């Protein structure tokens, strides 16, 4: 296992290509029919920042939940006493790129529970091994992970 380099994306293609997580299908708002296709994640071994205090960060697609749950396990295994942490899941704050996969629940921004930025390269490596369809060392403060639609 080698940590991803700063700004490295795996696989080596645009996020929204067929080879990656594939195309933006559209924004999901709290009204929408599609809102109901979002599972809240209550895995007790995942820290959700939820600074919004709405629980938005827990909402994601089935596929996102699955990869996130797998990564939760490999993070506890990688560092004794550390957990996966989510800063963003589904988003209604418009805090992303114009057509973020966050706006339809197909992306998470992640850290370790200790916010040790030296761990974050290895964290991205784990998110690839967990089966995220696109991993990106997006900033010094987070790894962005996304998934194909259902």
């Amino acid at each position, epitope marked *: 296992l080698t940590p991803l380099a700063y*700004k490295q994306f795996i696989p080596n293609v645009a996020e929204k290509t067929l080879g990656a997580s594939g195309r933006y299908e559209g924004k999901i708002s709290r009204n929408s029919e599609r809102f109901k296709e979002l599972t809240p994640n209550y895995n007790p071994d995942i820290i959700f920042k939820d600074e919004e205090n709405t629980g938005a960060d827990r909402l994601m697609t089935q596929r996102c939940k699955d990869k996130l749950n797998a990564l939760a396990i490999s993070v506890m295994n990688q560092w004794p006493g550390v957990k996966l942490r989510v800063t963003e899941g589904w988003d209604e*704050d*418009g*805090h992303h*790129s*114009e057509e973020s996969l966050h706006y339809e629940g197909r992306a998470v921004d992640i*850290t370790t529970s200790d916010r040790d930025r030296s761990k974050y390269g290895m964290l991205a490596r784990l998110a690839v091994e967990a089966g995220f369809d696109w991993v990106y060392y997006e*900033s*010094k*403060a987070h790894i962005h992970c996304s998934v194909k639609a259902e």
Partner: antibody
Amino acid sequence: QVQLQQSGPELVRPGVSVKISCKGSGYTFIDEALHWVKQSHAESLEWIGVIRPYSGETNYNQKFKDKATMTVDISSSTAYLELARLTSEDSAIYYCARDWEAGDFFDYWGQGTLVTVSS
Amino acid sequence: DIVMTQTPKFLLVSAGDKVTITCKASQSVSNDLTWYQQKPGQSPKLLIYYASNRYTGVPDRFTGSGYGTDFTFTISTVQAEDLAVYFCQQDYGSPPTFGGGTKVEIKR
């Protein structure tokens, strides 16, 4: 509504220290890092450093290593900047600013504290 | 430390016209480039991050581009209320560093 409320303006002699403050409201204080930014005519904007309230970890611009101390009081949701051994180059507006854990850049700024170093 | 050179230093521009500001870094800062707007008497306001993303509620007229050393900030159709000093800031290297700023003044 997130707000950073800074302490009032300060006149200090060269050689004296001054401690200014920045109180965070409308969010959970330990959720975000706090930064200090100096605005002078001489040097325009310069990053002094960052404190992480959650860990009390600090990182200083080496230019300010000897000049600046950052601390927080988690209880009052207040960050402090202490500037020691001041000269007229320290006269400036000092801001605090918050990141949103997406990189070291800042969506919320205090109104700024004008420090005049003068005899 | 990374030096950000911002040009021009001043622009005078009529409502409806284009503003183009350049920031060049002394070495590559990937896309870790932020643009702020400081209106007279105020604190800086963040408009653009990761070189090209608009912060929430920032209008369409504001755009950024670039990767590496060479970055561009545009106001497609400057309005009266856009008078301000614009600054870039890199956070690729430690410490973060800012450009010396561009003052935009309205010709009427």
